[PDB]
Structures are given as C-alpha cells and as structure tokens.
C-alpha cells in the first residue's frame with residue numbers, strides 16, 4: 001500500500017544504502033558497490049541447501065550464540081541492497097529475491113520469533129537483529145506483502161515493545177539513553193513505519209527526544225563536553241559515535257512524519273559537535289581514551305572510528321542551514337583534509353555519504369582552514385584534550401577518579417586495558433598511524449605511557465574499578481595552558497603517587513611525587529612506549545650524545561635529556577629531566593594478536609617495534625619530573641632545555657609546580673591548605689589545582705578544587721606579595 005509510510009521508507013533506503021544516487025562512473029561509489037558484490041557473492045555460495053538444512057550459514061550456525069542471529073540477518077541486508085541496485089549484477093535477480101524471502105521465513109520458523117527468549121546477548125535480540133530485519137524489509141518492500149512485513153516484524157515488538165527500556169523481557173531491564181536510545185529509534189521508528197503503526201512511531205520519537213537533554217549526572221552528554229555511558233565510563237568515542245551516527249540517519253525521516261522534533265530541542269546537537277566531538281579529533285583520528293573497549297577491535301582503529309563521527313556531523317550539516325551548515329561543512333572538510341593517513345572513503349558505507357563528502361571536498365565555497373589551538377578539560381569524565389596548531393601536535397590525558405571507571409572489559413573485549421587511565425598520556429604528532437596498524441594488540445599492557453605501576457601480573461578476567469580518591473582534575477587557564485593532578489593509588493592498593501601534569505602551550509611537564517610501594521614487586525613509571533615506523537627511524541640521543549638502543553634494556557644513570565630525532569621535525573620527541581634521573585631504554589619488536597585482547601578478533605600474529613623509556617622507583621618517597629617537548633629539532637630542543645633550567649619550582653608530597661618563564665605562566669598543584677609562596681611573587685592558599693599567568697603587575701587565575709568540582713573567589717586562593 002504505497003502511502004506516507006512507504007514514502008518515509010524510501011527516504012530511509014536512500015540514507016542507509018542510497019542506490020538512487022549510485023553512479024558507475026563514480027570511482028568511490030564503484031568501490032563500495034564492488035565490495036557489496038563480493039560479500040553477496042560469498043554469502044550466496046556458502047548459504048545452506050534447503051534440503052534438511054540445520055542452519056543458513058555454517059560459520060554462524062550455533063544459534064545459542066546470539067551474535068550469529070545478527071550476522072545472519074546482516075548478510076540478508078547486503079543482499080537486499082544489491083537486488084535493488086540497478087548496477088549490481090544481482091539487480092532484480094530472481095534467485096537472490098527468493099533467497100532473502102526463504103531465509104527470512106526459515107529464521108522466522110526455527111530461530112527468531114515471538115515464542116523465543118533471549119539466549120546470549122540481549123543486544124542482538126533487541127538492536128542488532130531488529131535493525132537488520134527492518135533494513136532488509138525496507139529495501140525490499142516491493143518484494144514482500146504488508147502481511148509478510150508485519151509477520152517478520154512481530155518478533156521485534158515482542159522483544160522491544162517499550163521505546164523507553166531495553167531488556168524488557170528479562171529479569172533486569174534498563175532505561176534507554178544515549179547511543180542505545182538512538183538505536184531504539186532505528187528499531188521502533190522503522191518497524192513502526194513498516195507496520196504502519198502511528199502510536200509506535202509517535203511514542204518512540206517522544207522517547208528519543210530525551211537524547212537532546214544535557215545531564216549533570218549519570219549517562220549522557222554534559223555541559224563541559226563529557227559523555228558518560230555504562231554508568232560511569234568516559235565514552236564519547238564509541239557510544240557517542242553510535243548516537244550521532246544513528247541519529248543523523250534517523251532525523252531526516254523523523255522530521256517528515258507527523259511527529260517532527262522541535263527545532264529548539266535539537267539545538268544541543270551542535271553543542272555535542274563543538275564541545276564533545278571536535279576536541280577529540282586530531283588529524284582525522286578519534287582519541288582512543290574516549291573509545292572504551294572499542295580500542296580492541298582491529299577494524300575500528302582511531303581514524304576509522306573518527307569517520308563514524310565525521311559522517312554523522314556531515315549529515316547534520318546537510319540538514320542544517322545558513323552559517324550553521326557552512327561552519328559544520330568547514331569543520332568536516334578541514335578535519336578530513338588534514339588526514340594524510342586514512343582514506344575517509346574507506347568508512348563511508350552508503351552512496352549518499354560518499355556523494356556528500358565528494359561535493360564537500362570539491363566545493364571551493366566551503367572554507368577549509370587549519371584548526372586553531374584548543375584545550376578541553378573534560379572534568380566530568382576525567383579526560384583532557386590539548387591541541388597546538390602552531391606546532392601541530394595533540395596531547396591526550398587519560399585519567400579516572402572516584403567518579404569514573406578506569407577501563408572497560410566486557411563482552412570479552414579489551415582484556416588488557418588495565419592501565420589505560422592510570423595517568424596514561426597520548427601524543428598525536430606527524431605519525432598519524434601511531435595508535436593504528438596494530439598498536440593495541442602489540443603494545444606492552446604493563447607499560448602504558450605515563451603510568452606508574454608495579455610489575456605484578458594481571459589477569460585478563462579482571463574488570464574495571466573506580467579510584468578511591470576524588471582528587472583528580474584539570475584547571476584550565478586558556479586554550480594553551482592547563483594543569484592537572486591525580487591522587488593515584490594502584491589497583492591492589494600497594495602503590496601510590498601524586499601525579500601531576502603541566503600543559504604549557506608547546507610542552508607538557510610530568511611530575512610525580514610521594515611514590516610509595518608496600519609490595520615486593522618492583523615499581524616504575526613508563527616515560528614512554530612509542531610505536532616506531534620502519535620507514536622513518538629515530539636517531540636516539542642521551543644527554544645530546546647518540547645512543548644505540550637494543551632489544552635488551554640498557555641503563556642510563558644521570559640522564560638530563562633524551563631526544564628522539566626523525567627526518568620530519570613534526571615527529572621529534574624530546575624529554576628534559578629537571579633533575580638528573582636514572583632511566584632505562586630499549587627498542588624491541590613486540591608481537592601479539594588482536595584475539596589476545598578481544599576474544600572475537602583474529603588470532604593472526606601482528607608485530608610492531610616499540611621504543612620504551614622507564615624510570616625505576618626503588619625507595620619510598622621517590623619521584624620523577626620531566627618536560628615532554630615535541631615537534632622541535634635537536635638544536636631548538638637543546639636551546640629550550642637551557643631556558644627551562646629553573647622551570648621546576650617544587651615537586652614534593654604537598655606541592656608540585658612548574659614555571660614557564662617565557663609565557664609568564666605557572667602550573668600549581670597543592671595537596672593541602674598550607675600557604676605556598678611561589679617565585680617570591682605570590683601565594684596560593686588552598687588544596688587544589690592552579691594555572692596562573694602574570695601580565696605586567698596583573699595576574700590571571702584559574703583555580704579548581706577537583707573534589708568539590710568548584711573554583712573559588714580569587715581572594716580565597718590567591719594573594720600577591
């Protein structure tokens with residue numbers, strides 16, 4: 001019955017597949033089409049023989065394993081996309097039409113129907129499979145009757161009758177929010193359309209509108225740009241991806257129903273883009289510290305995941321108008337063009353998304369200007385993102401506190417992310433491929449960069465924990481200067497350390513004090529564990545003298561500096577130790593497989609060479625202190641360390657401070673309320689984090705008490721002498 005419902009479904013098909021936009025003369029489109037051709041070809045030659053068949057596909061035959069249901073229906077969706085694509089060799093193919101129809105019927109009878117109960121993961125039964133069924137039926141609606149479409153979607157109403165909750169048929173349902181809530185839309189809004197059910201469409205849209213509300217607690221988007229999911233996990237880069245990706249697909253359809261969403265309610269989407277997503281995108285890569293367990297998926301490395309967000313942003317820009325549309329187009333364009341490592345088209349999986357990107361990149365009317373410097377203090381999720389446009393490097397600080405979980409290990413994914421939030425840092429430089437090409441399965445999980453830990457063995461079965469302390473946070477002064485601290489205690493309460501960071505425009509100082517260890521395990525701080533490029537080797541210098549690193553660890557006592565020299569100055573990394581320190585370094589090939597950190601991934605061996613720098617802490621009360629200076633050549637680095645000779649103000653159990661004489665900026669962390677006199681110019685009076693700038697006889701102050709998550713009147717925390 002061609003009606004308004006089918007009209008909406010046509011729009012939906014144009015969004016999730018876009019065959020109407022296909023052009024065989026379009027190189028990028030032909031590439032996606034050919035990819036679908038091969039997938040359909042493979043599925044057809046392996047699908048089971050309707051003569052006493054026990055399954056459709058042998059590799060997805062154990063229907064006790066819920067993932068097999070979703071994988072099975074997704075193969076049918078691929079067939080639907082090609083049977084409706086005029087340029088596919090399967091266009092209107094009678095055998096494919098019958099295969100989809102017969103497969104739907106078979107699964108309906110023996111595997112997935114209203115009489116079944118959830119076996120395995122609820123997600124497959126309520127989101128993955130319903131979405132695949134909806135899309136298959138929508139795309140091939142001209143090959144199914146309304147009665148058949150209602151028949152194959154009855155099961156969706158059984159497992160997902162309520163647009164506000166998921167797991168409704170289990171003994172522990174939950175409130176749908178964020179990414180999940182958006183998927184609720186892709187399940188019930190589309191099913192509603194297919195079933196011509198007005199109440200389902202309207203009630204579901206009403207539920208979805210909740211996603212536009214910013215929260216000050218719990219899961220969702222925060223005013224400061226943070227995004228929390230799974231109760232207390234920083235998750236902008238995975239669940240937030242799903243949210244923006246899925247919502248941008250749905251909106252064009254929703255806005256054409258009889259229950260469009262108010263334009264002012266949707267205004268917060270622009271806030272997510274500018275506050276939450278943009279800061280996490282550096283040279284086309286989505287910062288891993290925001291992606292949770294997804295970092296353990298081989299097909300979803302940083303640049304790939306970034307496209308999930310970018311394609312969503314672009315669709316939103318396309319449905320916008322005037323300057324809002326223009327500014328968003330410019331954001332997408334500059335980010336994509338800055339990525340010389342990843343081909344954006346590799347993750348634009350529909351013809352419309354491809355078409356949109358191509359027009360964007362060729363439209364001289366859309367400005368593409370390098371992004372300016374910024375520094376986001378995501379205090380509500382304990383992450384900080386810094387970007388310096390003049391020098392061209394990004395910096396990510398991954399922490400956690402009494403308010404957030406350190407790492408997420410679930411669904412057998414991210415088995416070794418134990419220390420990815422123990423003060424771990426990320427450096428985004430000229431090597432855009434650093435955290436890609438197998439970084440996650442080959443990096444030594446016991447030596448995550450920036451972390452202070454003991455060498456005790458950890459079990460893959462362990463799960464995340466929150467921090468005993470709430471004293472973790474960042475005080476931001478401006479777009480280039482901020483200070484952070486973390487009252488760190490390790491997983492088994494055998495080691496502590498006051499870890500602080502001083503972001504000073506073109507460098508970051510790392511200070512650690514009060515390092516205590518009560519175990520018999522050895523303790524140390526990993527200064528860095530950098531993944532190398534066989535094409536761009538580094539020349540290593542210690543105290544400005546060339547060193548030859550080996551697989552075997554070598555000790556370097558009385559170290560003043562370490563410099564990693566590349567042919568490209570934008571890959572250079574220098575470490576300046578305020579006080580001569582005893583460190584050790586090595587360069588070795590590290591092997592591993594994605595399956596080691598994610599049960600569902602390939603066991604194929606992967607390997608990468610890593611340069612590891614460490615500093616042992618053999619006595620209680622130990623400390624470390626060094627300045628990370630990226631993107632400058634050797635001579636400039638050497639010149640800079642002399643300028644910084646007296647930059648360390650203090651690094652003890654109650655006070656940690658670094659001074660940037662060139663900028664006239666101080667970074668200060670106080671663990672108690674004693675009066676601290678700084679550089680004989682002023683005093684700071686309260687426990688907390690400070691970033692101060694002197695401009696003449698004037699002083700600009702940025703104070704933050706991480707525990708109460710509040711600042712305070714200037715006179716309460718600052719006094720000029």
Ligand SMILES: CC(=O)N[C@@H]1[C@@H](O[C@@H]2OC(C(=O)O)=C[C@H](O)[C@H]2O)[C@@H](O)[C@@H](CO)O[C@H]1O
Nearest residue numbers: 121123124128179238239241242294308411
């Ligand atoms: C955010 C997240 O990790 N969601 C899990 C699912 O992963 C997402 O799957 C899809 C999709 O369209 O199916 C898109 C995303 O890129 C990917 O992160 C999936 O792993 C699912 C399996 O049960 O569990 C979700 O929590």
